[PDB]
């Protein structure tokens, strides 16, 4: 019989793994694509240092992750383990955004 | 007839450049005049702070048996001190990762 | 060659060998420490300028540097920073 | 020349990876598009300022140092790219 | 029988009143006493401008009131109407206090 | 002169007033002491800052300008006191 | 023998003091020189912002039938404008109060 | 004998009578306006100072101020301020 | 002998010609005498209204992704501002077209 | 050989680049603007003349023009036009 883990066990191992890891979790070139797409909405045909793209990737991942710890706090504060977009809206409203 | 040009960091027994920091204050436009002991005091404060953060970083690298300090070790050091994290809560380290933290309700029975 | 670009590599390396002769340093972590020291430096410079403005002081001296580091740094970090700076100020005062 | 859909380039498994880094055990299906919108908001907020810096620098190439300026403007100072 | 409002009606009316009002919700003299009590612990024989104590006041109700809308958002997130101190703790920690 | 527990000088009905200005409907009995501790932390931080201003000012008396400097140090700027 | 005195605020056609803002910027230590149009531009911006917020406060006062601007009027004017709220999300006002605001679940039935 | 103290009273009162000739004002509201106009003055001034540092310019021009307005003031107030300030700069240029 | 000539539009700092408008009012048979500030006031209000309709036209063109304003943009701008709409309800624009407007029962179902 | 003909193109061009540096213009849109400025000028001038006849005032001042624009321009447009013209006549008075 092919093994199947009970749910969340792999999720917890993922949590341990990616808390242990330091690297970026976003695909680099699609992120560059989206950054340039937002950029042309302000000024077209600009050039980018790849360092600027990596800095934006780091800051974006950090802001997202901190938002997710706040979301996790809200969800467990609501006595749930599944996060919801309303949790994110709550967290952003608490942060003053 | 000049004396030997001695260095003010050695005069205060310090590592950080007194002259460079004084030049930065003179050209950073914070006042037109700067008291002489002020960059010395600033450099000493900075040396103290760098000493503690580097010491914690080396301790963390030793804990991870690593002989060359890592930005991961910098994150682990800066976040595991209460006063340092209260000093630098809004500041992010590139490639720092996150603290290992799982809520107890997330943990299984 | 090119123009000189300022860096804090040598001083941080000396301080590292003061606290840990045995261990090494990565250059990206070196960039992190440069960002750190520049950030703290510009912070303290800012509150020094503000406090000198509040007392309408044309000269920035060590006493409000002490005030600002006591203001920003939390607790025993601030007190030991005061201690280290006071020691260095006395030693430079004695040349 | 133009770009039309790269917000979907931030795929669902990448958001899952970020959430596992965020300590999230379970993720709803409604999460991903809202996080895409939130990410879009944060990125546009920083990059409008970055464009402002770069144009004020009279450059057409975006530099990381301006990204540092923009991030520390919005209270989100990043270590590892200064200078 | 005597008149008696059902629970929450008086609360609604006083919420409307105090949102409409701007006047201080703290008795001034014990507030000044507490300010002197805390300040003596840090430096002896401290004297106060009364205006300084008042500014300390509106700062106090400002921070506290904003904390209670954060708490109310947490409570309505938690499907409750009665706030509990862990809601305040959540608001402080998500703000990063 | 020496004061002992003026933290309870912030009465429970005053806390109810503050909650109603925040639109809070129902308040637990556990709330008041916890909020007293929270406001204690807030006040001790800001008065530490304001004091440090005051002895740096070489003054014995706290001024409101020192207070507003302390609040703007914390990103909690207050208007209307000569700032 | 000498030209008659004419203000630079009038030279811009503005009310906000050009000379005062120029002196404050010079003594505020932001750069060792300053462009001539910079303080004029600054005073124009502050005059525009003051005028628009005074308009909003005037509307708030007229809606509550009061002739004079009140800090309550200022609070209502600023907090009901999402642009000015995002300008001043971290600004507190003395004796300002808050928006009259209730949650729908707090209302009966 | 009293030393003279600075305020924005005449300017705010005249612009109030421009925007609303029939509307009065309370004095502590004027104190709030004093704090507001001062606060925005150091916000724009500090932004202009650091932007002058970043391009290594020792002279802050209207371009720097306009850039700072685009930074701190979001959306429509920024572009309206740009238009009115450009008009003012143009009228000063004619002056 | 003679100072450099300064135009009254520049003295006002507004773009519309004060001298041209004053000459038009002198030769337009409206009064035997005209107060000096009256054509200035006229030029100011004209430049305000042209400025605002030019904002509306520029927004319309940018919404239509066009660099240059066209009479269709003028139609769309002037009909969607109610004060401007009833200001020019009886005023017709060359090649303006009409607003996109369909009555409710004209739609199916 | 031709005869010089008056138009308002260049002033509207300065106004357009003041409000939108990035936005162009078609010339027939400028013809519509020329009809606009001539028509509104004629309306205000005729109202001013008839008002000057009503009070038997042989001179039209900015008070009369203010009255006329308050009559024809509604409300929001009226109050902002009044503000702009008041500022303009004030700074002209200082000149």
Numbering used by the authors:
A (entry chain E), E (entry chain A): 37 to 133
B (entry chain C), G (entry chain G), I (entry chain Q): 10 to 118
C (entry chain D), H (entry chain H), J (entry chain R): 30 to 124
D (entry chain F), F (entry chain B): 20 to 102
Question: What does the primary publication say about this deposited structure?
Answer:
Here, we report cryo-EM structures of human H1-containing tetranucleosome arrays with four physiologically relevant NRLs. The structures show a zig-zag arrangement of nucleosomes, with nucleosomes 1 and 3 forming a stack. H1 binding to stacked nucleosomes depends on the NRL, whereas H1 always binds to the non-stacked nucleosomes 2 and 4. H1 contacts DNA with L1, the amino-terminal part of α2 together with L3, and α3 to stabilize the nucleosome and contribute to chromatin compaction.
The zig-zag arrangement is observed also in our 4×207 structure, in line with observations from in-cell mapping of DNA contacts. In all structures, nucleosomes 1 and 3 form a canonical stack, whereas nucleosome 2 is located in a DNA loop between the two stacking nucleosomes and is rotated relative to the nucleosome stack. H1 is absent from the stacked nucleosomes of the 4×177 array, but is present on nucleosome 1 in the 4×187 and 4×197 arrays, and is present on both stacked nucleosomes in the 4×207 array. Particularly high Δβ values are found for entry DNA at nucleosome 3, except for the 4×207 array, which is the only array where H1 is observed on nucleosome 3. In summary, as the NRL increases, nucleosome 2 moves farther away from the stacked nucleosomes and the trajectories of linker DNA at nucleosomes 1 and 3 progressively approach canonical values (Δβ = ~0). As a consequence, H1 can contact linker DNA, explaining H1 binding to stacked nucleosomes in arrays with longer NRLs. We find that longer NRLs are required to enable H1 binding to all nucleosomes of an array, thereby stabilizing nucleosomes and inhibiting chromatin remodeler activity.
